[PDB]
Amino acid sequence: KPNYTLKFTLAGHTKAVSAVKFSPNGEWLASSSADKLIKIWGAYDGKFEKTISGHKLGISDVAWSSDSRLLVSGSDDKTLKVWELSTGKSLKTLKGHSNYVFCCNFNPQSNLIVSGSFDESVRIWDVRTGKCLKTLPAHSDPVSAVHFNRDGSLIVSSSYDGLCRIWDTASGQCLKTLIDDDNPPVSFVKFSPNGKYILAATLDNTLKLWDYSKGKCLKTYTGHKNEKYCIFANFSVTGGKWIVSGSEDNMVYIWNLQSKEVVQKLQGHTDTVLCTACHPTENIIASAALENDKTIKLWKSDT
Amino acid sequence: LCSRARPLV
């Protein structure tokens, strides 16, 4: 079992924190917020680095490029912005979605960006030119998450419409629709680090590990509270193999991936833990919470 | 609040 304990609490955002992500090189933590700002922090010591500003309304997601040099954010101003970490410059503003942008990610090569929106579409953008390459009529309700697979050949999307869908990056064809015997909103999805599974959250207090190629649910993770918000979930692979997620009872939940048992609950936040992230090489978890809390917390474990 | 910080309608 892990032994995560609190090391740092990071105050700075003036509204709910919407996402936290460690840079692939392990150096930084990026946070986004309803306060319209992205903030960069030292991953190991929590030391504030810089604020990145530009969006006109709150931000729902931020993501790193594979080389840790760029970030992309999605906002209620209906744009995405591509940022250069070193300079803080907005290199491109991606305009095309007709409603709020909810989620975003680079592909492994960091030459494409995928985005999901309240306009019910998934869009694929060229990073270099900042132009919209494809618009997929993906869902019948807002798109809650989008993620590229290990080689970038596939995109997985999730939606409040209750569906998880797999898309061919090149053609834009819908290759698969995944759903279980109940039809609750799907609030989050991502491929596993090894690329052969997807982890999906639904708003019935349940996380599920799918073999997406076979279309079978392999594992379910329960114990947490999730009926309202699109809470991030993660694979922890640096020490023991865990599943990590936020919860609406104000705690971070950690499960054993294989046994599906709850192995730890991290207490400290004063509001719903909306976002969590796992560091790429060290046993470090970042967590952040909604309007009544406004803080980010860094937890560390020897296992 | 931004979209992710708004609860299920």
CA-closest candidate to residue A201, choices A234, A250, A173? A234
* Cα within 13 Å of Cα(A198), Cβ side: 30
State the DSSP code for A177. Answer: E
Contacts B7 to A, Cβ<8 Å: 228-229
**Residue A117 and residue A88: Cα distance in Å, rounded?**
25
Q: Which residue has the tokens 């290759």?
A: A175
**Residue A77 and residue A284: Cα distance in Å, rounded?**
32
Contacts A56 to B, Cβ<8 Å: none
**What is the separation of C-alpha A109 from the centre of its chain, rounded to a whole number of angstroms?**
18
CATH of the domain at A246: 2.130.10.10
**Residue B9 and residue A294: Cα distance in Å, rounded?**
23
CA-closest candidate to residue A272, choices A255, A252, A254? A252
Contacts A59 to B, Cβ<8 Å: 2
Q: What domain range includes position A218?
A: 1-303
Note the resolution in Å, 1 decimal: 1.4
Chain A, residues 189-208, CB within 8 A of chain B, namely 203
What single string gives the DSSP state of each residue in A114-146? EEEETTS-EEEEETTT--EEEEE---SS-EEEE
**Residue A37 and residue A14: Cα distance in Å, rounded?**
9
Nearest CA in chain A to B9: A228
Decide: helix, strand or coil at residue B4. helix
**Residue A251 and residue A265: Cα distance in Å, rounded?**
6
Total structural domains in chain A?
A: 1
Sign of CA dihedral B2, B7, B8, B9: negative
Kindly state the helix (H) or strand (E) to which residue A113 belongs, with its residue range. strand A112-117
Helices (H) and strands (E) in chain B, counts: 0, 0
Q: Which residue has the tokens 């680079």?
A: A106
Nearest CA in chain B to A19: B4
Q: Do B1 and A19 lie within an 8 Å CB cutoff? A: no
Tokens standing for A93?
A: 């503003």
A223, A227, A229, A233: CA torsion to nearest 10: 30
- Determined by which method? X-ray
In Å, how far is A215's CA from the nearest CA of chain B? 27
